[PDB]
Amino acid sequence: GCIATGSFCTLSKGCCTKNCGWNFKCNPPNQ
């Protein structure tokens, strides 16, 4: 499982997109 994008992350790794913003939410690639 991963963290859904738009959800709070602790690490970008956890996010399906492998990208989490500085706002601590998983973001899409190239944003």
Phi then psi dihedrals of residue 25, to 5 deg: -125, 140
| Residue 9 within any structural domain of the chain | yes
Burial class of residue 26 (count of CB atoms within 10 Å of its CB; 0-12, 13-18, 19+): buried
Q: What is the number of other CB atoms lying within 10 angstroms of the CB of residue 25?
A: 15
| Residue 31 within any structural domain of the chain | no
| Residue 20 within any structural domain of the chain | yes
How far apart, in whole angstroms, are the C-alpha atoms of residue 17 and residue 11?
Answer: 11
Which residues, 6 or more positions from 31, have their beta carbon under 8 angstroms from its beta carbon?
A: 19, 21
Tokens of 21: 């913003």
| Residue 7 within any structural domain of the chain | yes
Provide the domain count of the chain: 1
Which residues, 6 or more positions from 8, have their beta carbon under 8 angstroms from its beta carbon?
A: 24, 25, 26
Domain enclosing residue 2, as ranges: 1-25
| Residue 30 within any structural domain of the chain | no
